[PDB]
Every structure is written in structure tokens, then in C-alpha cells.
């Protein structure tokens, strides 16, 4: 394994954040946790995410990961700048 071995990944958030936002909240309900989204409308989205994914979200680990994506996504768009 030569030193020329790695896996980089760019980042393009600022853009689809719009469609991602509406989905993020509309996804939490489809994922099985409509309790979270309910916060979006309240704007209480930005908060200790990590402590949240643990707080309630405990069903399926594959459902915990994406949960950090939407929350982390809206948590930014929920700032209304």
C-alpha cells in the first residue's frame, strides 16, 4: 500500500439546503420520528444534535445516521439568517 492511498470528499451544502430543508422536516416524519420535525416549525431545531440522536432516536442505527444529516441541515436553515 503506497503512500498514494486515501479517500477525499468535497462539500456542497449551500445550495440544495432549500429542498433539503423542506425534506429534512418532511423526512423525519417518514423516517418514524415526526416529533423532531415538529421542532422545525418552532425553530428549536438548532441544539445539541448528538445529545438528541441519543435522547430519543434509538430505533435502528441506520435511522440514526441520516437523522444527524437532516437535523444538521435544518439546524442551519432554521436560523433564517
From Swiss-Prot:
Tissues where the protein occurs: Ubiquitously expressed. Underexpressed in hepatocellular carcinoma cells and some breast cancer cell lines.
Superkingdom in the source lineage: Eukaryota
Domain SAM: residue ranges: 17-81
Subcellular localization(s) per the UniProt record: Cytoplasm; Membrane; Mitochondrion membrane; Lipid droplet
Subunit structure: Homodimer. Interacts with TAX1BP1.
Function as written in the Swiss-Prot or TrEMBL entry: GTPase-activating protein for RhoA, and perhaps for Cdc42. May be involved in regulation of cytoskeletal reorganization, cell proliferation and cell motility. Acts a tumor suppressor in hepatocellular carcinoma cells.
Protein's UniProt name: StAR-related lipid transfer protein 13
Amino acid at each position: 500500500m503506497h503512500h498514494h492511498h486515501h479517500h477525499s470528499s468535497g462539500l456542497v451544502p449551500r445550495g440544495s439546503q432549500e429542498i433539503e430543508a423542506k425534506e429534512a422536516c418532511d423526512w423525519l416524519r417518514a423516517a418514524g420520528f415526526p416529533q423532531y420535525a415538529q421542532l422545525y416549525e418552532d425553530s428549536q431545531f438548532p441544539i445539541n444534535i448528538v445529545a438528541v440522536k441519543n435522547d430519543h432516536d434509538f430505533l435502528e442505527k441506520d435511522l440514526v445516521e441520516p437523522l444527524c444529516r437532516r437535523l444538521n441541515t435544518l439546524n442551519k436553515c432554521a436560523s433564517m439568517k
